[PDB]
Amino acid sequence: SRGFIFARHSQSVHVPQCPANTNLLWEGYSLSGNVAASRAVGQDLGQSGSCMMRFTTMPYMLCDITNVCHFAQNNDDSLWLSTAEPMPMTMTPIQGRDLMKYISRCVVCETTTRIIALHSQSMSIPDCPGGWEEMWTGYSYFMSTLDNVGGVGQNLVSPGSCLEEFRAQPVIECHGHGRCNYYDALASFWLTVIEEQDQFVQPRQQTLKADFTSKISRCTVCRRR
Amino acid sequence: SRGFIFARHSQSVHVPQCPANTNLLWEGYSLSGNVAASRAVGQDLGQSGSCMMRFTTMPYMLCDITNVCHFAQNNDDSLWLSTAEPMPMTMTPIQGRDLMKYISRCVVCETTTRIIALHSQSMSIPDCPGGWEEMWTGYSYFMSTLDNVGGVGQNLVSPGSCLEEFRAQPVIECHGHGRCNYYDALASFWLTVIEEQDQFVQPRQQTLKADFTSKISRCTVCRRRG
Amino acid sequence: YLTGILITRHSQSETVPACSAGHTELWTGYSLLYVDGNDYAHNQDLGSPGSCVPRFSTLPVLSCGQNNVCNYASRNDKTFWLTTNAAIPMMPVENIEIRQYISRCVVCEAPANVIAVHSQTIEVPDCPNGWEGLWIGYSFLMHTAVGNGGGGQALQSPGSCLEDFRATPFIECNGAKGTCHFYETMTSFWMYNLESSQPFERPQQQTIKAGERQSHVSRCQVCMKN
Amino acid sequence: GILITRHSQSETVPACSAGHTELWTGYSLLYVDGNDYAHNQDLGSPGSCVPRFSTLPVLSCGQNNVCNYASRNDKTFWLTTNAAIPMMPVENIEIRQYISRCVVCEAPANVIAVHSQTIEVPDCPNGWEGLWIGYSFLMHTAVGNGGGGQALQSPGSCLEDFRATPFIECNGAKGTCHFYETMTSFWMYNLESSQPFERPQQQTIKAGERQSHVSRCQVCMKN
Amino acid sequence: YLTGILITRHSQSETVPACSAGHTELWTGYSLLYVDGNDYAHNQDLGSPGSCVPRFSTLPVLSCGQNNVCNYASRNDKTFWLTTNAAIPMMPVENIEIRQYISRCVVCEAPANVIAVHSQTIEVPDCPNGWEGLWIGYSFLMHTAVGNGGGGQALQSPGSCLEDFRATPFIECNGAKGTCHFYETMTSFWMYNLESSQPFERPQQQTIKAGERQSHVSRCQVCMKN
Amino acid sequence: LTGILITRHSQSETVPACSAGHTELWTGYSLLYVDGNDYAHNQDLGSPGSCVPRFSTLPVLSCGQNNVCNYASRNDKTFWLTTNAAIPMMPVENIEIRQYISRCVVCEAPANVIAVHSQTIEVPDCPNGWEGLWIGYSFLMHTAVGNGGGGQALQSPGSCLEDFRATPFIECNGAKGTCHFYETMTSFWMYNLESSQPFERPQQQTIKAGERQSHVSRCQVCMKNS
Ligand SMILES: [Ca+2]
Ligand SMILES: [Ca+2]
Ligand SMILES: [Cl-]
Ligand SMILES: [Cl-]
Ligand SMILES: [Cl-]
Ligand SMILES: [Cl-]
């Protein structure tokens, strides 16, 4: 076996399962990216780089030219996929072991073939072509943006661009102080539904409050035979 | 008279009045800044540069090196002080003449002395120094930030850093498309209440609501007499 | 046995390209460079299938935020797409007129892996021993546009080398307006011809003019194992 | 004892009006790009008028008591003139044809700048007399989002001569100044043909018609 | 004829500075450089009274956003303050330890206007004819820190002229944690000594060390009209 | 053999060799990222794209819209993985740069290659069916000045470097052809979580001298047996 690996995110506090014809290497926490020195570098949610075995609000440290290193001494951030657990009505940052309720879990699975992701740009879940086996389906996740640090994006062919559950706020921000929370500048971008007749028409404005699947593109990840 | 001028913003659809012993030059609309080429450059809310006589969602145009100019052809933004008008429950961007309800008004007033602004960093309204006359009081407004374009800030001695009414969202964003709306990344920063004993204590985390002005610093603008 | 590698080629023309050799065509579409959402540029590698979008739109994405609210064409976002060889217009083209300016692409399946090699000289580099050639062109590294607009392709990806050399290889589409146009803030970066220099010599300033540009660009070849 | 600053936008040094007393002259500085950060100078304030010219008139100092001059890629930006744009970066002495000159004067009363947002020159308020007229200069960018803007009350937002590229970029370490295609300027628009609170009518303007769409302004001083 | 001019002086020491002769002291406080809120740096000019805040805090501001919610010390913002002459520690100082590292300032009232002149040489520049001198120092232009941290002083402002020359003139305070420290990402920019060059000569790379730095820094003087 | 490519960086002046039966394809110099038009485009240190055969301080060409290109006409920079040599006091130029540029090599491997991280002082063990190729330290992100920089994919071998240096890269001014280190350069490595509980608040630590290596997370690059 050649051993191509990928990652799967449950978007919940419980560990997901590896799909068919894949073996579990290790399980961990869904890492989305890091914001150091006001620069947001993201991890591909399809690769193993998005699945850390241990969770912490500050998983790294800075080291300057005077041969000293500072850990959690200044203000840097980390990014993690979040669960559907509602934040408390006090809408205060979560700290301590209550952070368990909000950090998604993940697994890293090895298989003999490669993994791709297909996006339909419509309401129909696309089927994979001949010779490919379906593992899971979801919604087309493009990127997430923060204020004045840029953002973190997913490659549309990586399985990380196909989240099994749609979330208006799929990513949570954690600080070196040891707390995580949602912040208003955190936005999420998804592929929209585009009919064949809408390909060259001026887009019409629409603010959705509910019934989101009518405007969210469907996706499917598949392995090869 | 030397004639130092300042600006006053009503933060409502009604035009404000010039304070005592000052003369009104012109009235207009409260301009907070502009976001061109993903860069937010702001106008000082105390100067006349924050009071445009005519309103538009795109008050400027770009001109390149080929001696051509584009107006509202690409995606640039403008910023204006906003009124207390609630956005519709459909939470769709406002366009058309309904924009009158959301753009603040302003006046530019000339006086014989200079105008300063003092911030108390507490809930008590600061008094004007000896020889200075009180014009208006308000809340310490520091800056506003947007996503990936920076932000617009106020100088703490300018009267523009002293808004007469506290707003969680004092600035509204308008586009070249002809629409305005609030967007989640729009934040507003205000000076907090700091007691003398808390000057070197670790700050305590606290998420207040809007009405809880007990954490917002008070300010006062002052002119001089003789 | 086949492991499942996918390759993507962009025609840079108005016609849809066909897959090379005995590779099974998976889908066709339009060449997407990057999306500028909330003034952040997120790119899709031109050698990745994500850069080939089957259904076109000046705004193929929508944004979601706090309070479970999503918005489509509700702000000032823009998209950037690979161009064809059409003539540069005088004004932004509208709706159906933009189709003649958007490149077409195709995504295929390959049995073995596919990479790209660069010579950094005027000569086209040969594939490594055991690898066959697919197409040749000019080494395309990164790009810069308006505001925070930018991005680049990985040097091992086939997207790092496009067939035609174009001084204007991408176009900016106003999202909510549905119009696309070229602007002077667009800049393309190509790998340089280093045949007249030694690996540690100081680069000499050069102003290249009409027609002389193709001679200073590095050549390449995209290779696969048979 | 109030100070006014005027920029010639040419190779000539400007002179103070009427009984305004000269304090010093110099070169028109727009902003500096040090350590990938742009720090602007108020074009209407004396700070934008620097006496000595240099492509890198600043010194970069760190933490370990060591400074560095012309040791990185910092650049400087200056108000240019109406001279012909070259094909390569200008170097050494011939660059002076691309640097505007300025002067600082003393005025008795306060000086401001008023804008009309129309093709008409705005009238100074009651009790004010005009010093010069011009075009509303709002913002400017060189590359990406690097650039700056002017306060619309300061006289710096009002330039006498209108050019689409009013500044030049000087590589400090290499000592060369040049123009680039990514440079864009932003001027207040002429809103005489617009309907109030309507969506702006997009326009692509070329050649001599551009001046007809620029807002006019006037720099006024009080008696 | 008194117009009401306000001046700001920074001691750069642990002691509070005093107002010049016949100046009315208005208030004293701590020297604030800029606040980094939501990764945007908004500065207060050291020559403006806004840079002198009487009550200190590692986070003297609070942010408000959508849904009428305000937050104090709820994220990852930091503040930057002008430092004193204390010895640089090896670790971030805590709470009360910060008082010996924060510069003191004073805001006074002056009868006539106050500006700053720079010579760009080792020699102290002369005040204009008719203007009296207040203090002299070294031309301080701009600064850069971590992330988007930065800012600068207006060249005519008294903040562009500091008495002491310091290679490390400011300190970074972690807002929510309440600790301050110096970092290698901090950089200070001073006007250069151009006496050994001609106004259009190409700058020569020079690495200046120890005591020789004071000779390459431009001198300055803060003047008032008599 | 499928045709999978592994990339190894020496972090020294010597060119590395492929392990076991891995076939060399090409060698070169370790490229980190390019700073073109104030935009940072990074290369995956674990991918063949980061290994470029020909070295140059500016191996790119900047082309605009009006059919005119410019080489070494601005302030663009290049960034390369440095070695363990001593940092000089002034920028090195011309040929002395070779002692500060890391070398790399691209090999072909039968099966897939990844990098696993431990987040602890212990070297992580490869999974069942995998054998380790080399061990090292978790290299996450890097910045040169401001927010300009980049980061590594934690699956790619580029996130796992054998030798740990606080400043693992060097900055080269392209137009003048000079390379140097700067104090604003910062590196980011995964932390050692050996004394922590999963959801505790991070214990802030300022580590100095040789103890810094004791707080860096360890990693191992593994390849599977078929
Ligand atoms: Ca924008
Ligand atoms: Ca931050
Ligand atoms: Cl939009
Ligand atoms: Cl430099
Ligand atoms: Cl905070
Ligand atoms: Cl260059």
Numbering used by the authors:
A (entry chain E): 3 to 227
B (entry chain B), F (entry chain D): 3 to 228
C (entry chain F), E (entry chain C): 2 to 227
D (entry chain A): 5 to 227
List sentences quoted exactly from the publication behind this structure.
Collagen IV is an essential structural protein in all metazoans. It provides a scaffold for the assembly of basement membranes, a specialized form of extracellular matrix, which anchors and signals cells and provides microscale tensile strength. Scaffolds are composed of α-chains that coassemble into triple-helical protomers of distinct chain compositions, which in turn oligomerize into supramolecular scaffolds. We solved the crystal structure of the NC1 hexamer, determined the chain composition of protomers, and found that Drosophila adapted an evolutionarily unique mechanism of scaffold assembly that requires divalent cations.
We used Drosophila pellet to extract and purify endogenous NC1 hexamer as described in Experimental procedures. Collectively, Drosophila collagen IV does form the hexamer, which contains both Cg25c and Vkg chains; and the Vkg “tail” sequence (not found in mammals) is not an integral part of the NC1 hexamer. Isolation of endogenous NC1 hexamer from Drosophila pellet showed the presence of both Cg25c and Vkg chains. We were able to obtain diffracting crystals of tissue-extracted NC1 hexamer (at 2.98 Å resolution) and CVC trimer (at 1.75 Å resolution) and solved their atomic structures. We solved the crystal structures of tissue-extracted and recombinant NC1 hexamers and found that the tissue-extracted complex is indeed a heterotrimer of the same composition as the recombinant CVC single-chain construct. RMSD of superimposed recombinant and tissue-extracted structures of Drosophila NC1 hexamer is 0.43 Å between 1346 pruned atom pairs (across all 1351 pairs: 0.47 Å). A slight difference between CVC hexamer and tissue-extracted hexamer might be due to extra linkers and FLAG-tag sequences in CVC and sulfilimine cross-links in tissue-extracted hexamer. Out of 12 chloride ions found at the hexamer interface in mammals only four were found in Drosophila. Only Cg25c chains were found to contain chloride ions, while Vkg chains contain water molecules instead. In the solved crystal structures, we indeed observed four pairs of double salt bridges from R76(1626) of each Cg25c to either E173(1723) of Cg25c or E175(1685) of Vkg.
